[PDB]
């Protein structure tokens, strides 16, 4: 009892958790919306030297309006791969750093945040690129015809699918899994309780058990990126793309339903993707 109490009232263990979530899990807005927004402005040899990516963070924290504390440091924005050259992948890590009396609890394997991070960042790539075409089309406006209005309905039909899968993530990995492990805490238990909080990767569709559900997501994310390439000289080339989108989405609703008989976490997904439809 004197060992656990020594952690909270003196070394602020309760602060570190509610601080790493502000940075890694992108809970604090105006930070991910400022970090991802900067990196996505560029896209090889550039954007890879420690002169830009090791400095874009020190420019990001200023626009956070929350942080700039001793906790806010130790955000090594490093990489783990050298990319050669339309896809939906940009590998990049973001590792926290701790000191001795706290390193013994937060394990150097609990590396799994970097697993759940690269997904959450990849999600932002949609809501920005899709925001671009929503903004790229705005300047086109006189030009009112069937070819125009029928085109914009695709964006509203594709955006809503991303704005609902994100609303799911913003409910499981940040709020309900945080209700536990916050009213759960209040020395060996701290290791297991933390190992049960993050194990966030189960409700996050990153587990290999429900992996086929994740494989289909790439087919969706890929087609939206192609939709961004064709910013009406090639309308029909885009009309075929949207029809492929409506098929894959209609296939997801069946593969998730068949995977209900075999996971109460996935139960809330069908209620999200389906509402007054089939």
């Amino acid at each position: 009892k004197a060992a656990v109490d020594y952690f909270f009232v003196e070394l602020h263990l309760e602060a570190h958790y509610e601080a790493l979530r502000h940075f890694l899990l992108m809970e604090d807005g105006e930070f991910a919306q400022s970090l991802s927004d900067l990196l996505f402005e560029k896209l090889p040899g550039e954007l890879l030297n420690p002169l830009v990516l090791n400095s874009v963070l020190s420019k990001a924290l200023q626009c956070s309006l929350h942080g700039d504390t001793p906790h806010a440091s130790n955000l090594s924005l490093a990489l783990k791969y050298l990319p050669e050259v339309p896809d939906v992948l940009s590998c990049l890590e973001l590792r926290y750093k701790v000191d001795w009396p706290l390193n013994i609890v937060i394990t150097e394997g609990c590396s799994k945040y970097s697993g759940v991070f690269s997904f959450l960042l990849q999600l932002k790539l949609m809501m920005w690129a899709l925001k671009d075409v929503c903004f790229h089309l705005k300047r086109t406006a006189m030009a009112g015809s069937v070819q125009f209005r029928q085109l914009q309905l695709f964006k509203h039909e594709m955006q809503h699918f991303v704005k609902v899968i994100q609303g799911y993530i913003a409910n499981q990995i940040l709020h309900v899994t945080w209700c536990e492990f916050r009213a759960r805490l209040a020395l060996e238990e701290i290791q297991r309780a933390h190992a049960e909080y993050l194990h966030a990767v189960f409700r996050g569709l990153l587990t290999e058990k429900a992996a086929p559900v994740m494989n289909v997501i790439h087919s969706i994310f890929s087609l939206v990126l192609k939709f961004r390439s064709q910013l009406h000289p090639n309308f029909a080339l885009m009309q075929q793309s949207y029809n492929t989108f409506k098929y894959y989405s209609h296939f997801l609703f069946k593969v998730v339903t068949k995977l209900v008989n075999r996971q109460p976490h996935l139960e809330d997904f069908l209620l999200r993707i389906n509402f007054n439809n089939y």
């Binding site: 604090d28 105006e30 929350h66 925001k131 809503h160 704005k163 209700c179 209620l271």
Partner: protein, 369 residues
Amino acid sequence: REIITLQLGQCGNQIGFEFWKQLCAEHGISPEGIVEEFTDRKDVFFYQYIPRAVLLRVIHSILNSPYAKLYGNNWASGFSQGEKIHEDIFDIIDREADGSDSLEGFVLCHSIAGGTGSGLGSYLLERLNDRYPKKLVQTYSVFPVQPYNSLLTLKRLTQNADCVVLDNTALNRIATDRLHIQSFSQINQLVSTIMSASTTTLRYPGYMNNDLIGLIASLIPTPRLHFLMTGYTPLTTVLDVMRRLLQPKNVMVSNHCYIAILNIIQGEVDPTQVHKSLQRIRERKLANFIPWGPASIQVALSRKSPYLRVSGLMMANHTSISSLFERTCRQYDKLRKREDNFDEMDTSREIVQQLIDEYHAATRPDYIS
């Protein structure tokens, strides 16, 4: 990204004033524009405190209020006065524009009930699309020769404003029922409450919807069907809030179905039950959506002002809003037969009748093509 507001006419300057009172109360900001001792990002609305207000008779009493340290009747005449001071007033906008870091939008608080501002509102939106083509504009218009000035400004609002209707009729019903007033400064008490909670996700950082384009882009499907309505229930769990919102007794509006809903919860409620309330609303089938595309309902959480209980706001895009226009334009044809070219009034009546056609076509399972 900074937001700036503009208030026109007698109405806009009144509700905007109480909007500044209630918002200044949320933060620890004394009436004298000085922070007291006593997380919340106060930089989007305030500039070092100085609010980004632009006020266009009652102004004298506004300065006579303790918050002084916080800074005809026809349509064509209201449009003429806007042209006579074209450059004189606009300098204030520009100097406040680039002096700001990065402008995001333009909140417009004005009335269309035959006021000089009603025309004054029509002019500004034309120029706001002229000078700044990359700046969103939002307007919290309010509904009541009154048919004339009302239907005209609708011609400009449907092609300039990229996005909140409030009809005084449905408001007074709430006034007599749950406040028992039988005044102007009495109903606006609730109106300012709707706007304050409307930007709960902006002044307080959250994960989703951290910018004004984050809220509007989901609801409005096409640049035409760009009309919204609001709801505010607290006047207790999550299933209590959303169920009390969908009732027509609370909506601030006088087949038919929804296109998208947004519910903002400000309380510290247990987030484990938010999915359960979503199940009970679906199964009882208390609301009806479009048949063509998959339309859902979205909810996000935030925290109240710690200085100041579970509140909640409901934002919706209902095709029943078409009925309100039909009430207006019908009066026009009756006034068209009863009383230099009178041609602008023609194209105005023409373009809105295209909108009333656009709503009635959205409720059909074959809205595409």
